Coordinates of C-alpha atoms and ligand atoms in Angstrom, one line a residue:
Chain A
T1 CA 145.9 106.0 131.8
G2 CA 144.5 104.2 128.7
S3 CA 146.8 102.4 126.3
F4 CA 146.8 101.2 122.7
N5 CA 148.7 98.1 121.3
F6 CA 149.4 96.9 117.8
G7 CA 151.4 93.8 116.9
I8 CA 152.3 91.6 113.9
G9 CA 153.6 88.1 114.0
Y10 CA 154.2 85.1 111.7
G11 CA 154.3 81.3 112.0
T12 CA 153.9 78.1 109.9
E13 CA 150.7 77.3 111.9
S14 CA 148.6 80.4 111.3
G15 CA 150.5 82.6 108.8
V16 CA 150.7 86.4 109.3
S17 CA 148.9 87.4 112.4
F18 CA 147.7 91.0 113.2
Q19 CA 146.7 92.1 116.7
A20 CA 145.1 95.5 117.6
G21 CA 143.7 96.8 120.9
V22 CA 142.9 99.3 123.6
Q23 CA 143.0 98.7 127.4
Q24 CA 142.1 100.9 130.4
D25 CA 142.6 99.8 134.0
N26 CA 139.9 101.4 136.3
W27 CA 138.1 102.7 133.2
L28 CA 136.1 105.9 134.1
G29 CA 136.7 105.2 137.8
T30 CA 134.5 102.0 137.8
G31 CA 137.2 99.7 139.2
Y32 CA 136.9 97.6 136.0
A33 CA 139.8 97.1 133.6
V34 CA 138.2 97.4 130.1
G35 CA 139.7 96.1 126.9
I36 CA 138.7 96.0 123.2
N37 CA 140.9 93.8 121.0
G38 CA 141.0 92.0 117.7
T39 CA 143.2 89.5 115.9
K40 CA 143.4 88.2 112.3
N41 CA 145.3 85.3 110.9
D42 CA 145.0 83.0 107.8
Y43 CA 141.8 81.3 109.0
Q44 CA 140.2 83.5 111.8
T45 CA 139.2 87.1 112.7
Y46 CA 138.4 87.4 116.4
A47 CA 137.3 90.5 118.4
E48 CA 136.3 91.0 122.0
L49 CA 135.2 93.6 124.5
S50 CA 136.1 92.6 128.1
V51 CA 135.3 94.2 131.5
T52 CA 136.9 92.7 134.6
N53 CA 137.2 93.7 138.2
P54 CA 140.1 91.8 139.9
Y55 CA 138.6 92.7 143.3
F56 CA 134.9 92.0 143.1
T57 CA 135.3 91.1 146.8
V58 CA 138.0 92.5 149.1
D59 CA 139.6 89.0 149.1
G60 CA 140.4 89.1 145.4
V61 CA 137.4 87.2 143.9
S62 CA 137.1 88.6 140.4
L63 CA 134.1 89.2 138.2
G64 CA 134.6 89.5 134.5
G65 CA 132.3 89.8 131.4
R66 CA 132.9 89.5 127.7
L67 CA 131.4 90.1 124.3
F68 CA 133.1 88.4 121.4
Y69 CA 132.8 87.7 117.7
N70 CA 134.6 85.0 115.5
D71 CA 134.7 84.6 111.7
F72 CA 136.3 81.3 110.8
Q73 CA 137.1 79.6 107.5
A74 CA 137.9 75.9 108.1
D75 CA 139.6 75.2 104.7
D76 CA 142.2 77.9 105.7
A77 CA 143.0 75.8 108.9
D78 CA 143.5 72.7 106.7
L79 CA 140.2 71.1 107.7
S80 CA 137.3 69.9 105.4
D81 CA 135.5 73.2 104.3
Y82 CA 133.0 75.2 106.3
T83 CA 132.4 78.7 107.4
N84 CA 131.4 79.6 111.0
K85 CA 130.5 83.1 112.1
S86 CA 129.8 83.1 115.8
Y87 CA 129.3 85.5 118.7
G88 CA 128.3 85.6 122.3
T89 CA 128.9 86.7 125.8
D90 CA 129.9 85.3 129.1
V91 CA 130.2 86.2 132.8
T92 CA 132.9 84.6 135.0
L93 CA 133.8 84.6 138.7
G94 CA 137.4 83.8 139.5
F95 CA 138.4 82.5 142.9
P96 CA 142.0 82.5 144.1
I97 CA 142.0 79.3 146.3
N98 CA 145.7 79.7 147.3
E99 CA 149.0 81.0 146.0
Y100 CA 149.2 78.5 143.1
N101 CA 145.5 77.6 142.4
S102 CA 142.5 79.4 141.0
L103 CA 139.0 78.2 140.2
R104 CA 136.6 79.8 137.7
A105 CA 132.8 79.4 137.3
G106 CA 130.7 81.2 134.6
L107 CA 127.7 81.3 132.4
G108 CA 127.9 81.8 128.6
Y109 CA 125.8 82.3 125.5
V110 CA 127.0 81.5 122.0
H111 CA 125.3 81.8 118.6
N112 CA 126.9 79.7 115.8
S113 CA 126.0 80.3 112.2
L114 CA 127.4 77.5 110.0
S115 CA 127.4 77.7 106.2
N116 CA 129.3 76.6 103.0
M117 CA 129.7 73.1 104.5
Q118 CA 131.2 70.7 102.0
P119 CA 129.1 67.5 102.6
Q120 CA 130.9 64.7 104.4
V121 CA 129.8 61.7 106.6
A122 CA 130.8 62.8 110.2
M123 CA 129.5 66.3 109.8
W124 CA 126.2 65.1 108.2
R125 CA 125.9 62.5 111.0
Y126 CA 126.0 65.4 113.6
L127 CA 123.5 67.4 111.5
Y128 CA 121.1 64.4 111.3
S129 CA 121.3 64.0 115.2
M130 CA 120.0 67.7 115.4
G131 CA 117.1 67.0 112.9
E132 CA 118.9 68.8 110.0
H133 CA 119.0 67.2 106.6
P134 CA 120.7 69.4 104.0
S135 CA 121.6 68.1 100.6
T136 CA 124.7 65.9 100.2
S137 CA 125.4 67.2 96.6
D138 CA 125.9 70.9 97.2
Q139 CA 128.0 73.2 99.4
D140 CA 125.1 75.8 99.7
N141 CA 123.6 75.3 103.2
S142 CA 123.0 76.9 106.5
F143 CA 122.6 75.8 110.1
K144 CA 122.4 78.0 113.2
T145 CA 122.4 77.2 116.9
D146 CA 122.0 79.1 120.2
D147 CA 123.6 77.6 123.3
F148 CA 123.8 78.5 126.9
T149 CA 126.5 76.9 129.0
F150 CA 127.8 76.5 132.6
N151 CA 131.7 76.9 132.4
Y152 CA 134.2 75.8 134.9
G153 CA 138.0 76.0 135.2
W154 CA 141.0 75.2 137.4
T155 CA 144.5 76.5 136.9
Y156 CA 147.5 75.3 139.0
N157 CA 150.7 77.3 138.2
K158 CA 153.9 76.8 140.2
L159 CA 156.4 77.4 137.2
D160 CA 159.6 78.9 138.7
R161 CA 159.7 81.7 136.1
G162 CA 157.6 83.4 133.4
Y163 CA 160.0 82.5 130.6
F164 CA 162.1 79.3 130.0
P165 CA 160.8 77.4 133.1
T166 CA 163.3 75.0 134.8
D167 CA 161.0 73.6 137.6
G168 CA 157.4 73.3 138.6
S169 CA 154.2 72.6 136.8
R170 CA 151.3 74.4 135.1
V171 CA 147.9 72.5 134.9
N172 CA 144.8 73.8 133.3
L173 CA 141.4 72.0 133.4
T174 CA 138.5 73.5 131.5
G175 CA 135.0 72.2 131.2
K176 CA 131.5 73.1 130.0
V177 CA 128.0 71.7 129.7
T178 CA 125.0 73.0 127.9
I179 CA 122.0 74.3 130.0
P180 CA 118.5 73.0 129.2
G181 CA 117.0 75.3 126.5
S182 CA 120.2 75.3 124.4
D183 CA 119.9 73.9 120.8
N184 CA 122.9 71.6 121.4
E185 CA 123.1 69.2 124.3
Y186 CA 126.7 68.2 125.3
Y187 CA 129.6 68.5 127.7
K188 CA 133.3 69.1 126.9
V189 CA 136.5 68.8 129.0
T190 CA 140.1 69.8 128.2
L191 CA 143.2 69.2 130.4
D192 CA 146.6 70.6 129.7
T193 CA 149.8 69.9 131.8
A194 CA 153.4 71.0 131.5
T195 CA 155.9 69.7 134.2
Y196 CA 159.6 70.7 134.4
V197 CA 162.1 68.6 136.3
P198 CA 165.6 70.0 136.7
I199 CA 168.4 67.4 136.6
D200 CA 171.5 69.5 137.6
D201 CA 172.0 72.0 140.5
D202 CA 172.3 74.8 137.9
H203 CA 169.0 73.9 136.1
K204 CA 170.7 73.8 132.6
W205 CA 169.5 70.2 131.9
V206 CA 165.7 70.0 132.4
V207 CA 163.1 67.3 131.5
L208 CA 159.7 68.6 130.4
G209 CA 156.7 66.2 130.4
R210 CA 153.7 67.7 128.6
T211 CA 150.2 66.3 128.1
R212 CA 147.0 67.5 126.5
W213 CA 143.6 65.6 126.7
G214 CA 140.2 66.5 125.3
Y215 CA 136.9 64.7 125.6
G216 CA 133.4 65.7 124.8
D217 CA 130.1 64.0 123.9
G218 CA 126.5 64.6 123.4
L219 CA 123.8 64.2 125.9
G220 CA 120.9 62.2 124.7
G221 CA 120.8 61.3 121.1
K222 CA 122.5 64.6 120.0
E223 CA 126.2 64.6 119.3
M224 CA 128.7 67.2 120.3
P225 CA 128.9 69.8 117.4
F226 CA 131.8 69.3 115.0
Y227 CA 132.5 73.0 115.5
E228 CA 133.6 72.1 119.1
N229 CA 136.0 69.3 117.9
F230 CA 139.5 68.8 119.1
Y231 CA 142.6 68.7 116.8
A232 CA 146.2 67.7 117.0
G233 CA 149.4 68.1 114.9
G234 CA 151.4 71.2 114.3
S235 CA 154.1 73.5 115.7
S236 CA 152.6 73.7 119.2
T237 CA 151.1 70.2 119.7
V238 CA 152.8 67.2 117.8
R239 CA 155.7 68.9 116.0
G240 CA 156.7 67.6 112.5
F241 CA 153.1 67.2 111.5
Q242 CA 151.1 69.7 109.4
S243 CA 148.6 71.8 111.5
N244 CA 145.5 69.8 112.6
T245 CA 146.4 66.8 110.4
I246 CA 146.0 64.1 113.1
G247 CA 142.9 61.9 113.3
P248 CA 139.8 61.5 111.3
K249 CA 139.7 62.4 107.7
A250 CA 136.5 63.6 105.8
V251 CA 134.6 60.9 103.8
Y252 CA 133.0 63.2 101.2
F253 CA 129.7 62.6 99.3
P254 CA 129.8 63.2 95.5
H255 CA 129.0 66.9 94.9
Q256 CA 128.8 69.6 92.2
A257 CA 131.7 72.0 93.2
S258 CA 130.5 75.7 93.9
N259 CA 132.9 77.3 91.4
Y260 CA 134.3 74.6 89.2
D261 CA 137.4 75.3 87.1
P262 CA 139.5 72.4 85.6
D263 CA 142.5 74.6 86.5
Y264 CA 142.2 73.8 90.3
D265 CA 141.8 70.6 92.4
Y266 CA 138.5 69.5 94.1
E267 CA 137.4 66.8 96.6
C268 CA 134.7 64.4 95.3
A269 CA 133.5 66.7 92.4
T270 CA 130.9 65.2 90.0
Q271 CA 132.6 67.2 87.1
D272 CA 135.7 65.0 87.8
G273 CA 133.6 61.8 87.5
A274 CA 132.7 61.3 91.2
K275 CA 129.6 59.0 91.5
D276 CA 130.3 57.5 95.0
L277 CA 131.8 58.5 98.5
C278 CA 135.4 59.7 98.4
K279 CA 138.1 59.0 100.9
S280 CA 140.3 62.1 101.5
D281 CA 143.3 63.4 103.4
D282 CA 141.4 66.5 104.8
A283 CA 141.3 66.5 108.6
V284 CA 138.0 67.1 110.4
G285 CA 139.1 66.7 114.1
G286 CA 137.2 64.6 116.6
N287 CA 135.4 64.6 120.0
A288 CA 138.4 62.8 121.7
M289 CA 142.1 63.7 121.7
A290 CA 145.3 63.0 123.6
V291 CA 148.8 64.3 123.2
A292 CA 151.9 63.5 125.2
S293 CA 155.5 64.8 124.9
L294 CA 158.8 64.1 126.6
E295 CA 161.4 67.0 125.9
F296 CA 165.0 67.2 127.1
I297 CA 166.2 70.7 127.5
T298 CA 170.0 71.0 127.3
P299 CA 172.6 73.9 127.3
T300 CA 172.9 75.6 124.0
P301 CA 176.0 74.5 122.1
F302 CA 178.6 77.2 120.9
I303 CA 177.0 80.1 122.8
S304 CA 178.4 82.5 125.6
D305 CA 177.5 81.9 129.3
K306 CA 176.3 85.6 129.4
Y307 CA 173.8 85.0 126.5
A308 CA 172.8 81.4 127.5
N309 CA 169.8 82.5 129.5
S310 CA 168.3 84.0 126.3
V311 CA 168.4 80.7 124.2
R312 CA 166.8 77.3 124.9
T313 CA 167.8 74.1 123.1
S314 CA 165.7 70.9 123.4
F315 CA 165.2 67.4 121.9
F316 CA 161.7 65.8 122.0
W317 CA 159.5 62.8 121.3
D318 CA 155.9 64.0 120.6
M319 CA 152.9 61.7 120.4
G320 CA 149.2 62.3 119.5
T321 CA 145.9 60.8 118.6
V322 CA 142.4 62.2 117.8
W323 CA 139.3 60.0 117.2
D324 CA 135.6 60.2 116.6
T325 CA 133.7 58.1 119.2
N326 CA 130.5 58.1 117.0
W327 CA 132.2 56.9 113.8
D328 CA 130.1 53.9 112.6
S329 CA 132.7 51.5 111.4
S330 CA 130.2 48.7 110.7
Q331 CA 128.3 51.0 108.2
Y332 CA 131.6 52.3 106.7
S333 CA 133.7 49.0 106.5
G334 CA 135.4 50.2 103.4
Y335 CA 137.0 53.2 105.2
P336 CA 139.6 53.4 108.1
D337 CA 138.0 53.1 111.5
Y338 CA 138.0 56.7 112.7
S339 CA 136.6 55.6 116.2
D340 CA 139.9 53.8 117.0
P341 CA 142.0 55.7 119.6
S342 CA 145.1 53.6 119.1
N343 CA 146.4 55.3 115.9
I344 CA 149.1 57.1 117.8
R345 CA 151.2 59.4 115.7
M346 CA 154.8 60.0 116.8
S347 CA 157.7 62.3 115.9
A348 CA 161.2 63.1 117.1
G349 CA 162.9 66.5 116.8
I350 CA 164.8 69.5 118.0
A351 CA 163.7 73.0 119.0
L352 CA 165.6 76.3 119.4
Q353 CA 163.9 79.2 121.2
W354 CA 165.3 82.7 121.6
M355 CA 163.8 85.4 123.8
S356 CA 165.0 88.1 121.4
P357 CA 164.7 91.9 122.0
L358 CA 161.7 91.9 119.5
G359 CA 160.1 88.9 121.3
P360 CA 159.9 85.1 121.3
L361 CA 161.3 83.2 118.3
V362 CA 160.8 79.4 118.1
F363 CA 162.2 77.1 115.5
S364 CA 161.7 73.3 115.3
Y365 CA 162.7 70.5 113.0
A366 CA 161.0 67.2 113.6
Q367 CA 160.4 64.0 111.7
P368 CA 157.3 61.8 112.0
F369 CA 158.4 58.3 113.0
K370 CA 154.8 56.9 113.1
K371 CA 152.1 58.2 110.8
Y372 CA 148.9 57.0 109.2
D373 CA 147.3 57.3 105.7
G374 CA 146.3 60.9 104.9
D375 CA 148.6 62.5 107.6
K376 CA 150.7 65.3 106.2
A377 CA 154.2 66.1 107.4
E378 CA 155.7 69.5 108.0
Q379 CA 159.2 68.9 109.3
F380 CA 160.4 72.5 109.6
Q381 CA 158.1 74.8 111.8
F382 CA 158.5 78.2 113.4
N383 CA 156.7 81.0 115.1
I384 CA 157.6 84.6 115.7
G385 CA 155.7 86.5 118.4
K386 CA 153.3 85.6 121.2
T387 CA 150.4 84.3 119.0
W388 CA 150.4 80.8 117.5
Chain B
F1 CA 148.4 81.4 123.0
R2 CA 146.6 79.7 120.1
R3 CA 142.9 79.7 119.5
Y4 CA 140.9 76.8 118.1
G5 CA 137.8 79.0 117.2
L6 CA 136.7 80.3 120.6
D7 CA 138.7 77.7 122.7
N8 CA 142.1 78.7 124.1
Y9 CA 145.3 76.7 124.2
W10 CA 148.2 78.0 126.3
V11 CA 151.3 77.0 124.3
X12 CA 154.1 75.6 126.6
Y13 CA 156.6 77.8 124.7
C14 CA 154.9 80.9 126.4
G15 CA 155.3 79.6 130.0
Ligands
LIG401 C1 132.6 99.3 133.6 C2 131.6 99.0 134.7 C3 130.9 97.6 134.5 C4 129.9 97.3 135.6 P1 129.0 95.8 135.4 C5 127.9 95.9 134.0 C6 126.8 97.0 134.1 C7 125.8 96.9 133.1 C8 126.3 97.1 131.7 C9 130.2 94.5 135.2 C10 129.6 93.1 134.9 C11 130.8 92.1 134.8 C12 130.2 90.7 134.4 C13 128.0 95.4 136.9 C14 128.7 95.3 138.2 C15 128.4 94.0 138.9 C16 127.0 93.7 139.1
LIG402 C1 159.0 65.0 133.5 C2 157.6 65.3 133.9 C3 156.6 64.1 133.7 C4 155.2 64.5 134.0 P1 153.9 63.3 133.8 C5 154.2 62.2 132.4 C6 154.2 62.9 131.0 C7 154.6 62.0 129.9 C8 154.6 62.6 128.5 C9 153.7 62.4 135.3 C10 155.0 61.5 135.7 C11 154.7 60.8 137.0 C12 156.0 60.1 137.3 C13 152.3 64.1 133.6 C14 151.1 63.3 133.5 C15 149.9 64.2 133.6 C16 148.5 63.5 133.3

């Protein structure tokens, strides 16, 4: 039978999150599981319709299709400001290679409608590569693209259990490339790994090694769109840093602020006296990213053996860098070199996780030990629920 | 999970 689901969560990364949806396995006897779901948090509203048949072949090759919509406000994600309203569709074949591996191959279409972009160097450099030349002194602008992509994926999952793993690894590799006829011309690859190594026979002392890598670039003279950038920093990547703070910072052009009021703060506003380019501490992401973490899981102090399996205590060293391979350092010698991958941020901290009756609760306290100009710290972080 | 626009990031805490 059909089912409805409604959830509410909260975290330092995304604020209050609302989730609503409907799902029906074998909807109307078609053999397709059909779902309609939406999510809303501080910076994004996302909705999707999905239809998937787990047995497109008798050997478990799956066929799935999706329709989706995204409304995103970048200032609400602690980035330099822009609005993106996007939508599209995709079709994906999933192949179970063996017990622990699956491969995915699909085709996608996506329309992106960018507007309210606050003028800044890296973003205008991408726009220029597309033949778009909006004004540098106003936030009233528009840029739309239509892209078609080939999408591929690989997931390896041999984690020993679905919650609090003590052994095994989970690896996810995702890639895509535009198909000729798309407005953009680029490729993009993301790799995530989590490996757990138990030390004791009882698996109460475990070492987790975690990595995340991202790399994308334009084909030809076009750059990868800034709306496909990678980010780092926050409760789920490099703990102890404010969400998305790591890496390049916007270099703003002097502009007349859309709704000026001397009661609020603005970046490079002409009304404040701005007549030249302004350095800032607003993150913009980058086309290259790497994160690494070593985390030592220990027994939880002053807790009962009966309720030990419900709580996880851990101590970690997190590391992260994000960079812009197309940053022109020679042209912007008076600004930090945002193309430099060696500005590795580091933090050390502790985390407490509880698989409570209501759901997963995660708290962390971490201190940056290595940071750069413009990076913002957020020592205490937490998340309640399954959305981050 | 965490979304970065339309991209997905499986958070290790969910594993
Ligand atoms: C709920 C029944 C859905 C059937 P499909 C879509 C039919 C036209 C709208 C599912 C396609 C998945 C990508 C067509 C089956 C395979 C060719
Ligand atoms: C305890 C697990 C360590 C997993 P690795 C190292 C992670 C460091 C942060 C590989 C170690 C080989 C000896 C994962 C590397 C993936 C690209």
